[PDB]
Ligand binder design. Structure first.
Ligand SMILES: *[C@@H]1O[C@H](CO)[C@@H](O[C@@H]2O[C@H](CO)[C@@H](O)[C@H](O)[C@H]2NC(C)=O)[C@H](O)[C@H]1NC(C)=O
Ligand SMILES: *[C@@H]1O[C@H](CO)[C@@H](O[C@@H]2O[C@H](CO)[C@@H](O)[C@H](O)[C@H]2NC(C)=O)[C@H](O)[C@H]1NC(C)=O
Ligand SMILES: CC(=O)N[C@@H]1[C@@H](O)[C@H](O)[C@@H](CO)O[C@H]1O
Ligand SMILES: CC(=O)N[C@@H]1[C@@H](O)[C@H](O)[C@@H](CO)O[C@H]1O
Ligand SMILES: *[C@@H]1O[C@H](CO)[C@@H](O)[C@H](O)[C@H]1NC(C)=O
Ligand SMILES: *[C@@H]1O[C@H](CO)[C@@H](O)[C@H](O)[C@H]1NC(C)=O
Ligand SMILES: *[C@@H]1O[C@H](CO)[C@@H](O)[C@H](O)[C@H]1NC(C)=O
Ligand SMILES: *[C@@H]1O[C@H](CO)[C@@H](O)[C@H](O)[C@H]1NC(C)=O
Ligand SMILES: *[C@@H]1O[C@H](CO)[C@@H](O)[C@H](O)[C@H]1NC(C)=O
Ligand SMILES: *[C@@H]1O[C@H](CO)[C@@H](O)[C@H](O)[C@H]1NC(C)=O
Ligand SMILES: *[C@@H]1O[C@H](CO)[C@@H](O)[C@H](O)[C@H]1NC(C)=O
Ligand SMILES: *[C@@H]1O[C@H](CO)[C@@H](O)[C@H](O)[C@H]1NC(C)=O
Ligand SMILES: *[C@@H]1O[C@H](CO)[C@@H](O)[C@H](O)[C@H]1NC(C)=O
Lengths: 48, 192, 96, 713, 384, 48, 96
């Protein structure tokens, strides 16, 4: 593991949109349009 | 216009020479009110003693310590390359100073949607009802660019003032005295 | 070990002739720009204030010279420590 | 112009055998060297210095081999099939002249001889239409006016003229039964005064022997200094004519082609043929001549580096390589070591994805029958879910004014809308100023006010006397007043934008006389009064059409009558850039197979930023739409080793392979061929040019992210 | 700073004095552009328009426009009046016979067969569209039989109606097919193509009215090196060798116009270009006809710094980065009082310091530890 | 961190005074003299 | 503090290229096709100005929070105790 228990609680208490560093370009097609991660999926549409 | 700096390079040389001459001192008293004329080598050995090196070791390895210090001072030259982070910071500050001027000068050469970037060309090629709009477009763009430049200059001036305060703190703590903190005056146990 | 660190204290002080920069001395452009208020005077005041603040900051930093006691370091070897790399060389051929 | 004395007599026969010139022994490949700015036209906009800029224009592709043309020397002349090969003048071409001019030469007709090589100027025949020679049916005959570039003066002058090449009938000449190819001979054996100063018209005389020059618009010539340096010649055509470029113009010691001539050839040039040249050198002083290479000019983005003297010393073909894309994105020839996010500079051909709903035809019949209504009582037609033919409606009228807002008159006939509203009425075009936006008078106040809330067009048209379906009314009637007469009086009522007048019911009785007034008592005791102005209709009845359109997001049902086929993206045009027009929605995109997502009953799927993300097709398959540049490309550059590698961030390697028609040409080639350093899947995306090494490092200058480092070769 | 009460300090100030400016005109000698083909013979039809391109010549647009009764002069990115007094790198004119009653069909973005198949205007350059009537007095232009424009230009395929549309400024693909004129209205011409499809065109024929009407499409280009296409002007070639030097002038050199101050300058730049630009496209130098390279600067180029002491109510001027001799010889740029003080050799004259030329100062041996008026480079202004 | 991405993506959807926020829509609905103005407006806004 | 307010108030008086800085004047003097363009010009300018004001306010708030942290440090070190540092609590040897 790479997280202590208190680290696990702190990370579970914070919501962060997961950037698909690996295969994230294809993960955005499978998921479809979602408001929560639309900014992550807008990488390949807006151009950033 | 690029304004000249407040001080001649000779005044900066005097500042750094006074900094070099202020290195030696008592380094053991409880204030800044008295100045002791302890020479530089004795002050360095006292700083080493304060670090945690006993006087027996300092007396034994006098020439060895002096040789290591001289080797460090002579190897200080090698740090003026692109690999070093501080030299990169120096070149980055120079490049930012150049970039501000380059952006300010280059923003006068783009048309901003008008037929030309020259007011004379707009006046020659167009007539009042249209040339008014073209000159207004150029004016709006140049005003926005100048406002952005002035805001960035204010931000840079505030950052430079804060960094000058930090430099004064570093001079007072690391240069004019010895630091018992960790990482403020570099890695390891600070000497001089 | 020697740790090298750069702390900036100044930036290049720039004053912009707002009227010439925006209008290049054209009466039509100046008349059109006058509709934007007092832009050039405000720009001049902002730049002047920034340069003044930088001047005071640098003067404050350099003021430590007047109230700092020093000792005359020996040229070259100071005891057994070689400080020639950090000292200003003294040559009588020309100016210091 | 005067082309000179008409040629008389027989032509010189030539032996045509491509099997000798087109041999693997004569192949001397000379690819375009972009690092030397080879074949780069110096831009005419400005003469920059000591600065690196990106430029879009006609440039050759990097490392382009081009086409090589080899000429020999002669009695009977020896030439290749060049005169019968018709190349395509797409955007122009550049000619590399005399790259070898001091080495040993292998004459293609002679054998076992190595003469010093001498450069030659090419001869071209550029025209608009091409055809056959009558007695031989051999291709390569240029019809109508033809532009001919012809070197002369033993190589010190070039002839440029544009006119019809009428073939002759004498033997060995063009247009005869014994015609083989259009060869032109220099004949330096005292027929050019090569030993003396170079002054002759031998080349032009030979061409006049081959063809009859008649009705000839222009004839220029340009002096060429007799040198031996490598030369560059280029030709392009635009609205200003045909432009000729030469490196000799500004500095023959440089590699930049500068504009030196504009030819008044305004019709589009579509073909060019290389005129074979076989000079008549006797066996006493036979020589081996050079070869010239022709490279096609493509519309490409180029990063040009200008010398301190203003000359382009090196260039970068932006779309050729990923390192080239890195150089062009940051506009820096010398890029430091690092990992960079780069842009896409390669332009790939795009297909078309058309999906149009089947609908009936909108009927403008009420607009074209009966008497047109008066302006205050205009008739309104609203069209939804139908196919309109605006050409049919506009061909029956003589339009005098077609003012439009937020849309163009041409786009009004080729666009799709959610609705199409047309207000039409009888209106005299002499009253045109009263229908304009913001206009004063009674027309806007009391008759009709245009509504500028949607893209709207105002058409003033004249009904021709031939069109008898529309009947001219007695007069033109418009309201001059519409008010409520109170105790104080004159409470004027004004038209709302796009609405009818409050006095419409009062005015329904009509107006027979000019300045006739109608009054009605309201229940509050006040009188509603209207007044009409009556003026006669001229020779032709004139109408006014106010066309307003609305653009929808889901489906633009009102589409023009187009015979476009319903393309299929199931197999073709998939994972490639296309220009789509689906149910009235247009744009560029890349379509991928996806599981059906998005809100139900919706044809198009959008994200929270109104970007077209999905599309439900007619074939029951849902597709994902991408902006045609979507895969993030990262270039890992090591300056010391001068080696680069590509990282496709966040993309799987299989999808990188399938979606190959989006990257640089070298990347496309490497993805086509199953190279052993193929795409590699990492934790930061697909990596091209990498290998997993199981190596552990404590620091790196090329961090890929997620504790990954690129170790340079 | 728009402040009546300014605090003590050193300020960068603007220039408010307006000085009279001369004129520096240098025009190249060129022939006269010939509009003769435009004024002789029968004007071509719209689909077969004639293009005239003028380079390195002198045009008299007044002469051309005085022979016609202009009905419309719509222009883009240029004015009709500036079309007669401007200089260009090229001047392209497309002219054809066109009825002014069909004016709406020649407009930008217009619908119909005129733009689709006959002529599409190009808007990549400053272009003017002129609709003019040929008066009956002008007998050099012959009225044609009719007005002819193409209504279709398509390739007949299996599905049919593959319409071919005009490129902006280009000819129709059916130009060769339409070489044989259309004698009747709605006459169609068809040509067999080697692919097996038929190329078809159709022309609309309508009679010319009482006066023949033409359409002129004038497009111009502007160059940064030399605008050779210049109007015929009797302006003299002014000399800046002695007069108009170091003073602001309104120059017009080989088609390039603007305001600036010309200085003697050693020839630096590319050895072929007449004009010298910097990396920001500013006209910096100019090679003149007299063999002397002049060194262009804006009308306000010299930086002026004012040193103000509120307590003494005294002010002084610092010309930053400028030598004092150049300040003297270039006095016609500053305020009236500064000009007067530079004209008269006052004993507190310009003083050369390490930060530029100083006006109102005296060299002093005084050494200070602080100052409220720092001139830079360890220099302080001691108020009187 | 999320609001920077959201602003960057959302600035591509608003028209800035033009008839549309899509360059393709402007090219389809207008003609070169007006197309240039609308695309220039969009370009200026996006650059700022 | 005064300048932020002055800029915010004064940015509502300049026409930004329009015929007037008042929306009512534009509506009274022009008609919908041109009214939209002029009001859009005013809207674009005021939106840019308000965005710049908000960004500057955020920067000033962050700077004020950092300076408040510095003031807390100064209170803890120089006011509530005696500092052995040099130059943190003024020149010389700090007392109170
Ligand atoms: C002390 O340091 C100085 C400066 O580093 C040394 O002087 C250098 O000596 C070398 C070797 O003779 C010369 O090549 C250099 O020119 C000298 N100057 C500099 C600036 O490097 C000096 O040798 C050292 N040692 C002593 C005992 O003085
Ligand atoms: C180069 O071109 C010039 C210009 O077209 C030619 O000079 C003309 O020649 C024709 C006959 O071919 C004469 O009728 C004209 O009077 C000539 N002069 C003009 C138009 O100014 C010339 O013959 C060509 N060839 C050369 C110089 O070798
Ligand atoms: C052959 C194949 O895998 N086709 C598609 C693939 O392109 C797409 O990425 C995926 C998404 O669900 O659906 C499947
Ligand atoms: C009298 C005199 O010195 N004239 C000019 C001077 O103005 C100019 O600055 C210099 C080149 O820089 O050439 C000389
Ligand atoms: C729908 O929107 C709500 C808004 O609160 C959000 O919480 C939820 O995750 C969204 N659901 C999706 C995107 O599937
Ligand atoms: C020569 O060119 C002709 C076309 O002109 C072509 O058909 C023929 O194959 C060529 N011969 C070669 C390449 O040997
Ligand atoms: C050329 O083509 C014609 C027409 O098909 C044919 O009759 C003739 O034999 C061909 N060959 C010639 C003229 O050599
Ligand atoms: C030219 O001749 C060839 C001989 O094979 C023939 O196939 C071709 O159709 C001819 N072309 C024309 C345009 O007549
Ligand atoms: C062009 O060539 C064709 C085909 O030979 C011929 O019919 C026509 O008359 C020529 N001229 C024109 C002006 O089209
Ligand atoms: C040449 O031009 C004349 C008029 O000068 C014309 O009658 C003749 O048909 C033309 N000949 C061609 C195009 O072959
Ligand atoms: C060939 O020799 C000539 C004459 O000396 C020289 O100018 C030229 O540069 C040489 N090289 C080439 C490639 O022509
Ligand atoms: C539209 O109307 C024209 C009128 O001539 C007709 O020829 C055409 O077939 C119609 N349909 C189209 C263009 O789809
Ligand atoms: C231009 O043409 C007019 C026509 O009257 C003539 O008087 C004048 O001399 C010409 N030249 C000019 C204005 O330079």
């Amino acid at each position: 593991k790479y997280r202590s228990a208190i680290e696990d609680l702190l990370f579970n208490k914070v919501t962060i949109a997961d950037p698909g560093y690996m295969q994230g370009y294809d993960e955005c097609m499978q998921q479809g349009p979602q408001s929560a991660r639309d900014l992550i999926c807008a990488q390949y549409v807006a151009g950033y | 216009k690029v304004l000249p700096p407040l001080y001649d390079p000779y005044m900066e040389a005097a500042y750094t020479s006074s900094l070099l001459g202020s290195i030696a001192g008592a380094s053991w008293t409880a204030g800044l009110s008295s100045f002791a004329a302890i020479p530089f080598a004795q002050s360095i050995f006292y700083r080493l003693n304060g670090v945690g090196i006993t006087q027996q070791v300092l007396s034994e390895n006098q020439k060895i310590i002096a040789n290591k210090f001289n080797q460090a001072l002579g190897a200080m030259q090698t740090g003026f390359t692109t690999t070093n982070l501080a030299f990169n910071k120096v070149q980055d500050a120079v490049n930012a100073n150049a970039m501000a001027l380059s952006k300010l000068a280059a923003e006068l050469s783009n048309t901003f949607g008008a037929i030309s970037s020259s007011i004379s060309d707009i006046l020659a090629r167009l007539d009042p009802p249209e040339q008014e709009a073209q000159i207004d477009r150029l004016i709006n763009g140049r005003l926005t660019s100048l406002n952005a430049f002035v805001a960035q200059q204010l931000v840079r001036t505030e950052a430079a003032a804060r960094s000058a305060q930090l430099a004064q703190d570093k001079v007072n703590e690391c240069v004019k005295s010895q630091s018992k903190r960790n990482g403020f005056c570099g890695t390891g146990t600070h000497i001089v | 070990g020697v740790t090298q660190e750069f702390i900036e204290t100044t930036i290049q002080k720039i004053t912009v002739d707002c009227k010439q920069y925006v209008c290049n001395g054209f009466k039509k452009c100046e008349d059109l720009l006058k509709e934007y208020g007092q832009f050039c005077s405000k720009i001049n005041q902002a730049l002047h204030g920034a340069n003044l603040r930088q001047d005071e900051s640098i003067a404050n930093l350099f003021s430590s010279i007047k109230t700092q006691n020093t000792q005359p370091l020996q040229a070259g070897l100071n005891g057994d420590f070689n400080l020639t790399m950090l000292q200003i060389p003294q040559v009588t051929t020309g100016e210091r | 112009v005067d082309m000179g004395t008409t040629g008389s007599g027989n032509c010189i026969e030539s032996q045509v055998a491509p099997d000798f010139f087109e041999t693997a022994r004569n192949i001397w490949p000379l690819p375009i060297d972009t690092s030397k700015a080879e074949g780069v036209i110096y831009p005419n906009g400005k003469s920059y210095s000591n600065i690196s800029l990106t430029y879009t224009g006609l440039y050759p592709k990097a490392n382009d081999l081009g086409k090589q043309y080899i000429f020999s020397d002669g009695s009977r002349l020896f030439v290749s099939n060049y005169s019968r090969q018709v190349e395509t003048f797409d955007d122009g071409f550049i000619v590399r002249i005399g790259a070898a001019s001091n080495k040993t030469g292998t004459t293609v007709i002679s054998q076992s001889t190595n003469r010093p090589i001498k450069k030659i100027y090419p001869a071209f025949m550029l025209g608009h239409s091409v055809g056959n020679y009558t007695p031989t049916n051999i291709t390569g005959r240029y019809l109508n006016h033809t532009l001919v570039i012809l070197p002369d003066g033993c190589g010190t002058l070039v002839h440029a003229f544009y006119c019809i090449l009428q073939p002759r009938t004498q033997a060995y000449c063009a247009g005869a039964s014994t015609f083989t190819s259009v060869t032109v001979w220099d004949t330096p054996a005292s027929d050019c005064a090569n030993s003396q100063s170079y002054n002759q018209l031998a080349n032009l005389n030979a061409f006049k022997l081959y063809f009859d020059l008649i009705n000839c618009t222009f004839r220029y010539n340009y002096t060429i200094t007799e040198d031996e340096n490598a030369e560059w010649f280029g030709i392009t055509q635009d609205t200003q004519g045909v432009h000729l470029y030469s490196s000799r113009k500004e500095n023959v010691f440089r590699n930049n082609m500068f504009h030196f001539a504009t030819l008044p050839v305004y019709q589009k040039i579509l073909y060019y043929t290389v005129i074979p040249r076989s000079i008549r050198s006797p066996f006493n002083d036979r020589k081996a001549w050079a070869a010239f290479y022709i490279y096609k000019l493509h519309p490409l983005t180029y990063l040009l580096n200008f010398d301190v003297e203003g000359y382009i010393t090196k260039a970068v073909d932006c779309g050729y390589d990923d390192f080239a894309q890195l150089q062009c994105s940051y506009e820096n020839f010398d890029v430091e070591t690092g990992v960079y996010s780069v842009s896409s500079f390669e332009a790939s051909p795009r297909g078309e994805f058309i999906e149009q709903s089947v609908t009936k035809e909108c009927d403008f019949s009420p607009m074209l029958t009966g008497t047109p209504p008066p302006i205050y009582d205009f008739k309104r037609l609203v069209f939804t879910n139908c196919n309109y033919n605006l050409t049919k409606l506009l061909s029956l009228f003589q339009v005098s004014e077609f003012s439009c807002h937020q849309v163009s008159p041409s786009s009004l006939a080729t666009g799709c809308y959610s609705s199409l509203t047309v207000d039409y009425f009888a209106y005299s075009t002499d009253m045109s100023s009263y229908l304009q936006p913001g206009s004063a008078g009674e027309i806007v106040q009391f008759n009709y006010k245009q509504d500028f809330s949607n893209p709207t067009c105002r058409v003033l048209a004249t009904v021709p006397t031939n069109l008898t379906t529309i009947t001219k009314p007695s007069n033109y009637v418009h309201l001059t007043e519409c008010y409520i007469s109170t105790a104080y009086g004159k409470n004027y009522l004004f038209n709302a934008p796009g609405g009818y007048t409050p006095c419409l019911s009062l005015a329904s009785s009509g107006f027979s006389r000019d300045r006739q007034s109608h009054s009605q008592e309201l229940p509050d005791g006040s009188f509603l009064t209207t007044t009409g102005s009556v003026y006669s209709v001229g020779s032709n009845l004139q109408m006014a059409f106010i066309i307003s359109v609305q653009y929808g997001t889901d489906t633009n049902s009102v589409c023009p009558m187009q015979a476009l086929r319903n393309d299929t993206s199931i197999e073709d045009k998939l994972d490639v850039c296309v220009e789509y027009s689906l149910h009235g929605i247009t744009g560029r995109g890349v379509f991928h197979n996806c599981t059906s997502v998005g809100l139900r009953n919706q044809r198009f799927v959008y994200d929270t930023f109104d970007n077209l993300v999905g599309y439900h097709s007619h074939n029951g398959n849902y597709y994902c739409v991408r902006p045609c540049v979507s895969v993030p490309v990262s270039v890992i550059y090591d300056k010391v080793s001068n080696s680069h590698a590509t990282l496709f961030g966040s993309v799987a390697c299989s999808h990188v392979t399938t979606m190959m028609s989006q990257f640089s040409r070298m990347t496309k080639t490497n993805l086509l061929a199953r190279t052993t350093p193929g795409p590699l899947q990492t934790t930061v995306g697909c990596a091209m040019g990498f290998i997993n090494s199981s190596m552990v490092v404590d620091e790196c200058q090329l961090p890929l992210g997620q504790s990954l480092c690129a170790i340079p070769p």
